[PDB]
Write an enzyme that holds these catalytic residues in place. Structure first.
Site, mmCIF file in Angstrom:
data_model
loop_
_atom_site.group_PDB
_atom_site.id
_atom_site.type_symbol
_atom_site.label_atom_id
_atom_site.label_comp_id
_atom_site.label_asym_id
_atom_site.label_seq_id
_atom_site.Cartn_x
_atom_site.Cartn_y
_atom_site.Cartn_z
ATOM 1 N N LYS A 91 0.792 -1.223 0.000
ATOM 2 C CA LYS A 91 0.000 0.000 0.000
ATOM 3 C C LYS A 91 0.826 1.277 0.000
ATOM 4 O O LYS A 91 2.016 1.300 0.360
ATOM 5 C CB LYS A 91 -1.036 0.025 1.121
ATOM 6 C CG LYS A 91 -2.351 -0.641 0.750
ATOM 7 C CD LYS A 91 -3.200 -0.829 1.979
ATOM 8 C CE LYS A 91 -4.438 -1.649 1.681
ATOM 9 N NZ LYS A 91 -5.413 -0.828 0.935
ATOM 10 N N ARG A 127 -4.067 -10.060 4.129
ATOM 11 C CA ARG A 127 -4.404 -10.106 2.707
ATOM 12 C C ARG A 127 -3.219 -9.544 1.946
ATOM 13 O O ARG A 127 -2.929 -8.342 2.041
ATOM 14 C CB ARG A 127 -5.673 -9.301 2.427
ATOM 15 C CG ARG A 127 -6.135 -9.352 1.000
ATOM 16 C CD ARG A 127 -7.373 -8.509 0.809
ATOM 17 N NE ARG A 127 -7.696 -8.397 -0.603
ATOM 18 C CZ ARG A 127 -7.204 -7.458 -1.406
ATOM 19 N NH1 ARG A 127 -6.373 -6.526 -0.920
ATOM 20 N NH2 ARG A 127 -7.551 -7.451 -2.691
HETATM 21 C C1 LIG Z 1 -8.031 -1.372 -2.764
HETATM 22 C C2 LIG Z 1 -7.354 -2.706 -2.653
HETATM 23 C C3 LIG Z 1 -7.251 -3.222 -4.061
HETATM 24 C C4 LIG Z 1 -6.778 -4.640 -4.160
HETATM 25 O O1 LIG Z 1 -5.677 -4.993 -3.635
HETATM 26 O O2 LIG Z 1 -7.528 -5.470 -4.755
HETATM 27 C C5 LIG Z 1 -8.118 -3.582 -1.685
HETATM 28 N N1 LIG Z 1 -9.108 -4.335 -2.070
HETATM 29 N N2 LIG Z 1 -9.790 -5.116 -1.189
HETATM 30 C C6 LIG Z 1 -10.857 -5.914 -1.714
HETATM 31 C C7 LIG Z 1 -9.544 -5.220 0.227
HETATM 32 N N3 LIG Z 1 -10.299 -6.045 1.028
HETATM 33 C C8 LIG Z 1 -10.059 -6.135 2.388
HETATM 34 N N4 LIG Z 1 -10.855 -6.984 3.215
HETATM 35 N N5 LIG Z 1 -8.975 -5.346 2.937
HETATM 36 C C9 LIG Z 1 -8.223 -4.511 2.122
HETATM 37 O O3 LIG Z 1 -7.215 -3.773 2.676
HETATM 38 C C10 LIG Z 1 -8.515 -4.443 0.716
HETATM 39 C C11 LIG Z 1 -7.762 -3.594 -0.247
HETATM 40 O O4 LIG Z 1 -6.725 -2.830 0.199
#
Ligand SMILES: C[C@H](CC(=O)O)c1nn(C)c2nc(N)[nH]c(=O)c2c1=O
Ligand SMILES: C[C@H](CC(=O)O)c1nn(C)c2nc(N)[nH]c(=O)c2c1=O
Lengths: 264, 264
Positions: free
Chosen positions: A210, A244
């Site tokens: 990030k 994640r």
């Molecule tokens: C914007 C970024 C994009 C990506 O990497 O696909 C993102 N997408 N999604 C679905 C996420 N879901 C959860 N639970 N936590 C997150 O920190 C997060 C994310 O940072």
């Protein structure tokens, strides 16, 4: 510490033994394609297998309007759930997408709007009896008190979920790092993550690659592995149950070392 | 938090701003050489420069009997201190080596025996007014209580040092991970590192690539970067002021991210 397992239809996730690794699927779409094309799905299955082999415990699959999003993600969920014996999360804030994805084989809902963009998503989660990740998000960065406010916003989400009939054991929380937060507020949320534990729900931490890491280290996105690692290590030390991540192999190894050291 | 800087003759180390990175010098000796040969010293200077460029804050230079050890390490300390503007530590437990190294240009003493193998080393440290790293070590793994015992053993070292006339500000402590400890006791010492803070001395953590990481991850020495990283992150979170590492570039980046998150 957790008196239940995370129940994911065919799969079960023990929240006590280890930090659970959610691998982020490359869903690079084909131009000229509605969705479902061979190069799209195969690339995704290949990447899913790859992450499964590197230590991932969940595959996060996301994303064009509603009708297109389904057509892009359903065939991927169909093939991945067929070919990769691993629970899949559907990265969506939309009720209709959530439904289709689960019908297609998805096990967990990953909602970056914490049931606030489309409250019916929680009705969906309730009905299919699936875990839902409620991520802190808001349309502004106007906090009185970051952590106190975060916890309030997470509770508003928990409330929407429970009102819809979502069981406590199907709720996962997420501090939403890099969402509606300054680089400095992200650091602050990291430094105080353990405060989320009082709400009594498992916590997923999404920090991989990030912007805030890039702000600290002054490194571009492809040079963020060490910094991501640090956020992952701190997150596990501050009690979080899931991470994640993009770099499954590496983070999986860091998580495992953290786990051993903290006695998890 | 620290009301003094670590005074290293020409160089000064602020203990408050950031985790200080001690890079481990490759001192690969030439066969057929007493010491001082061109390929030996040049390889070491090259590696010192390299680590200096990667974010190291101190260069640790170590090691054949006493007379040979000096002849191997002095010419290296001479050339490195000349060509790399960075404080050097002499990795030695021997009084006579310590003396020669400082005469040759070394700033810090790094004693893996915590003044216990050769108590006169502390007289040396006292006389040259240099920082000394007292590492926990013992000839046995027979603990009543690991942490309690470690702290007792570290105090015995602090006592030897202070009796010799070493000033409190020239004392650094080190839990001695991977020394006289089971893989399990190493994990335990990691999990409880913060307990060393009560003694009121800066703490150096040396975990890089160590055997216990390999025991946890079941990975050989060259596959230990992620695990080392995890130990480094936990060490910084548990308050330690220095990390002694092989992979300077990477750890330096993790330290920097940890620092930002914890507010150091
Ligand atoms: C914007 C970024 C994009 C990506 O990497 O696909 C993102 N997408 N999604 C679905 C996420 N879901 C959860 N639970 N936590 C997150 O920190 C997060 C994310 O940072
Ligand atoms: C055995 C290992 C060998 C090496 O890497 O050169 C070693 N040497 N030295 C000098 C050390 N000094 C301090 N202060 N702390 C350590 O953990 C440590 C070590 O682990």
């Amino acid at each position: 510490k957790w008196d239940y397992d995370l129940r994911c239809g065919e799969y079960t996730l023990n929240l006590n033994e280890k930090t659970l690794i959610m691998g982020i699927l490359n869903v690079t779409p084909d131009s000229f394609s509605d969705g479902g094309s061979y190069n799209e799905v195969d690339a995704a299955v290949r990447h899913a297998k790859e992450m499964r082999d590197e230590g991932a415990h969940i595959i996060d699959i996301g994303g064009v309007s509603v009708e297109e999003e389904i057509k892009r993600v359903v065939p991927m969920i169909q093939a991945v759930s067929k070919e990769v014996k691993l629970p899949i999360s559907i990265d969506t804030y939309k009720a209709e997408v959530a439904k289709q994805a689960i019908e297609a084989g998805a096990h967990i809902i990953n909602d970056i709007w914490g049931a606030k963009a489309e409250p019916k998503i929680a009705e969906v989660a309730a009905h299919y009896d699936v875990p839902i990740i409620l991520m802190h998000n808001r349309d502004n960065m106007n906090y009185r008190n970051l952590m106190a406010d975060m916890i309030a916003d997470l509770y508003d989400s928990i409330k929407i979920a429970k009102d819809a009939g979502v069981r406590d054991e199907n709720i996962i929380l997420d501090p939403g790092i890099g969402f509606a937060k300054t680089p400095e507020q992200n650091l602050e949320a990291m430094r105080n993550l353990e405060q989320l534990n009082v709400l009594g729900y498992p916590v997923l931490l999404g920090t991989s690659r990030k912007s805030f890491i890039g702000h600290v280290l002054d490194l571009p996105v492809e040079e963020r592995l060490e910094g991501t690692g640090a956020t992952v290590c701190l997150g596990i030390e501050k009690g979080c149950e899931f991470v994640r991540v993009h770099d499954v192999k590496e983070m999986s190894r860091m998580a495992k070392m953290m786990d051993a050291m903290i006695g998890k």
